[PDB]
């Protein structure tokens, strides 16, 4: 609620608290810390390998050995968690997305390796069929090319179970099938994975901002499962279902173009609330900074926005650069 | 909000997403051309057009060229322009006198447009930053601090001069405390009964204004200077409601949040709490980052309408956007 | 709040508690050094340091010693000090004239600090209790009652003298009705445009101020006297909202609850209803009880940060705390 | 909600009602009475025994015969209920916490004795494994030393049933296992203990304020079941679950450092709401009073705080001293 | 309110009802003697006591007898009396001049009580109905309508006279628009800084005042007259919030609902919306109906405390009740 | 919600609308009509019989033939419903309350008679064991004299079914057993009584105002099932359960001493909300009117109070007198 309390110029001058650095610090409503940051990482199949991504300047795909080397620095910076995104070899893609639950799939191998080397580092796996399907569709298709809901869930459940077996502390379904959070929850509980967190992509929109991601993972209609950008009330129904179904955290994706959604979600549910600053937001920002059009300070500014809007944690490709700025 | 015990599989939220016709029926918000305001950079002189490297596709234009281009903006149905003059270097001063010159660029441009296109809205910029040698939004004391009340005296003269030139809307972008009331009191006194005041109510001390400062040429004046003693801390949300409340008490006809996309949560809170006409500026840095990504082939041209739909969804009534023409074109077609 | 039908075993709230990394991600509030204000007891004279038996570890300091100690407070990043002068006995009077002496301890200390540490916030104490022979916060009528409006006249002189000495913030701790408005009107008139007024809005007639009254030396003056005709009844919560509402209407830049931990529910209500910068005093008695338990080995040193985290969680923007240095040290390390 | 109603100085002078004792009494919002008070008591195994506790000055551990003697005075003062805390002999501690449900365990014996002698006195037993485990962990441990949730619940249920058999009118689970209120409720109902109250420790924090208690009971990580002190929204989810699960009362612990939590709980749920002024709060206050740093009046002041914040009842080591002050 | 999915048999609300100790723990409200105000009918003369047939057990008393009885009211801890004078017939007039007579019964009684019992609260009645020949609460125009502003002029004189006699609280029971502000402005001007104003804010045009009109002797004056042009329509609830809002804006220290039990829903709305000190009058008709039933053996004496507990539960801070002594006796024992 | 809208004297003068009868009528917020009225009636076992009740002046007990004669007038006045209260012969009272479900019990006979003669008249039967138990206890007793919850429900269900069989359109459980609304609902549905309304006595208080009723029915502790008069929040939990359990209407009893409860119930649930102006409220009012202490107008005034507080219907012994005043 809001009560203006009859405040009026000149008795009230809001510039007074702005006058000095010390008073600005005292009244500052929100601060970003490294504990708000999650780093998404693109993981290759090989050894001794890194690759640059044309539409995501400065982001590398890394083989698992290279991932372990870089995680030393991420852990030193205090980054609490990584979000793993495998770059599936084309030979391993299929109509049935079976690679999703392969015990020696990239995500499963990367998870085992990280859990052993850095036991305190959070590993959030991606529960999703798009990296494993022949054309990059987000699930199993019917004769009309429609992504079947419940049949896709069956595969997502096997995948989530395989991640839990590999040691993942958090599984993060990014698929937008109806009811999948509940299905995954019933399977994790039945299997005795009682502490495995489910970070639901609850209000994920049918967005043009995912363009560069598809270059990153090598996966390059969605309006039949991802949300219409026009819709806000609908996001509340999505999150309400996911919390009833057992999610430990709920996410809004994309991020900055949906800050109003972050605010409403946090205000209405008062649950742990996450947001993804996606590949397109990263690319636009990094592009402008590299062109000398925007100052490097826009990085923190965009991240501060998430905190102010109500987010508990941010999946961001800027995580390491932000961590280094926060530290010094 | 009441969830009403809705539960899978009785409730499957993909059912409404199944077909175009049903997505359309349930669609919560739609952008139209009546939501669009085009900011324009206005040069002195005749037959002048200048590219802006940090705003690819945007041109500074002399008044003659402005009048020509406005034919298609009007044909597109764009309801209003926000004018931003590019002050010649020699007209910048300590006292910012050029702000209220009846022969200033902003004043000349307003008279020309009001005569040529009587139905087109003209929103003038009330601000001293285009006219100061230091590039700060007001008059400095001997410590280099921007004096609040003394700066308002100049802003008042400026707003009065815009009303005299025929501007239907004056928009104070300065972030002085109390200037909405001061300007409103001056307009009323002078008989400018229906001149609208579009307050920049919750304008943040942001890094996203870089390309604009290049465009109007205040970048070299400002140098490394900042506006943290008047523009708002990016961290602060509750404070925005206090800013808006005062501007409404002071007589604003419209209230605005700036920047736009990095502050959509502020747009939402402001529309929810006050239920007043609420405006948002998609600023130069926002424009530049989208255009850069599009020209690189990193983002599809559809992001333009996606970014604008967000403002509508968040609660905005109108959007100042350098994409206005491209958007109106795409909405028309 | 909507529970969203969450139910065991689908919802197990221990899952987020399982690992340090996930506890960290979901952590709702974190104390930083920018939340801390250090109250300091200031003696007259030179090279003076005095222990306080009821506040183990806290020293009264002369200005010279204050300036030395402040080097490490600034190095620690502590944003502000709240100054509390220890008035010599012979300077106490019926009329509390010493309150506005330009050569009073508070005034001398402010000038010295503002010159030495220009970025350090100085919050002065607007109050007559250090200066009266009876120890009450104002001027007595012939029934021994603290006169409201006549006391304000003195508080106004005092606040003006602090502004003249350079104090960025004046903090009226007196609990006279209407004094925020009176002081604000005086500051504005005199041109002190940006001097902040941190109102002690909801200050309770509490027993937890004992050690402070010892520290500043008002204990012997007050004797068995009480402040129930001005400070608030501990029983009353709704009344705090009326106190805050008035202080905001009167121009306060910040509003404060005192004491702190025994009144966390008041902090919560005040931040929830007004959404204004909200401050809380962890008072001398609170300090003393924690330090006593720690020195006895009854409570671990971690209670310090636990007690301060509570203020943040409850809604406080800033905390006046005698633990500021120990806390800043522990946050730094 | 709040409406300021345009009240303004000098028309409004809030000191007017403060002018006189009579008007202060008329407008006084909250009062503490003895019916708000619950006395926690430390119960020894022997006969003819009392012991002092170094970190809780003035508090005695008492054998059951001594407990019955002292309860005469507590009953005379009108104290409605005791909260029993057994001091387990070290020979009776085990990995399996079996002493928790022993029909002749201290708590069970004390309960039978009190129920017979003072039939109108409320007896609130502590449902908890920490007094009965070899090292004082709050439940049954896995190989990694993690407190297993559901397996601990099994023992807590047997304990709660044994308390109900002994005659306890209220059982009070202080363990912070997920779902235990529901488990205890299903067992009490199945067993025909239909009027046995469950007072849930709903929002119990991982606190440094419990130090002296561990000296009192002879039990001297918790962040994996007790709440992070930083978290407020989370307390609402905890209480919502406990009410759905069948709790008759909900509690916040510790007390004064969490008054904001008391306020939110009472405001949101409007259910019987309890608060524990824990051993550390008692010790700090009593210490300062004994040192001559704080006046005895801080006792009432701290207790009045609970009432004002929304608490229906307070577990306090000051109960008897407060009862004597309230009476005269 | 959130039901939190509570469901039989997991939730059995009789469990807390099972034992006295648990009912006590969960008990939401408890009446104490500090909630009680005793209205008293005061006669002229010496050694006068008169029974009231319609208020069985209540006596009109001369000042001397009042002073004697007050010894036990004070011993019982009753915080305040509300004085109601029984004006001699010959002192009633068109102009209600007796209202402000310094030697009126109300004024004499106040002086006597303030001297004898300095800690006892005295609430005087600001109203013209005891003093008019027609029995209406003010001055009539030539159509027989009660003039609003002209009546306030008299009420102001009356309130001033009560403040002069030493009354700590004046209570305007007249229901003129704006009289709270008028009286407050007069008190402030004259230096009566701390005289409380207990507004009868939402006082209904009720039939339950019959026995009171007999008690003070205004019944024969009023005859068949009604007060529907000033007292509120019994049908109206929303209107009460507008009445209260104005009285608070005008400076009331306490707001009151009258009658009491037939208007408990109004007590609840008023306390919920404003969170101010809220008072309720258990009127003469309410007293009479309870006492009649008790004396008939139709209702047990326990209804007295039940009826008073209701006011507390509904949100009242204090209750004017002719049962004050019987209640204080029963609470004491 | 409430917004004062800065209204201020003298621009705002609330007496303006009060100036004239016409403007008072236009702005009048609530009106009582006969459709708000329910008449409770005391029904005797015999023929050709009426009896006066000492503590309820002007109220008669009536045999069924006399009830049918009087109902002609009640129906002519437009009174929508009667609430039947049998006066059980002492020979028919028992420990097991079997008379409660007797097909030829007074309530069942009265119901059949009225349903046949006046098919449009609402008949609300009382579901309750107190008229049928040996000493007037509100249910079946254990060895300690405690009213057993679930075992009493079994009898209440058989009674409710017998009322439904007799033709009653509404059954009204006045017992305050936990969960009885649900039990009665499951039985009515199973038995095919799908349109039988259940009017729950949801927030019924342990009150002294029931004194004269006990004289009326010949039935002359309750704190273990009826609510503590001190408790308001608790009434919300009571009504929430009864609506979840299937009640078509919810009631607050007693009436005028609980108008705040009526207001909260209607505000929070927005469901059909009833209130009982009980025998003690009737007696106090009628007593004062007969003594010449209060004018007859207090009857309407008290009834108007119910409407204003949020009640949809009022059980009142004044129903006929009020109906005649409303008509003319
Ligand atoms: Mg979904
Ligand atoms: Mg502003
Ligand atoms: Mg104040
Ligand atoms: Mg729990
Ligand atoms: Mg009025
Ligand atoms: Mg019930």
Curated annotation (Swiss-Prot), chains A, D, F:
Pfam families cross-referenced by the UniProt entry: ALAD (PF00490)
Single Gene Ontology BP annotation: protoporphyrinogen IX biosynthetic process
Job of this protein: Catalyzes an early step in the biosynthesis of tetrapyrroles. Binds two molecules of 5-aminolevulinate per subunit, each at a distinct site, and catalyzes their condensation to form porphobilinogen.
A GO term from the CC aspect: cytosol
Disulfide bonds: none
Activity regulation, free text: Stimulated by magnesium ions.
Protein name stated in the entry: Delta-aminolevulinic acid dehydratase
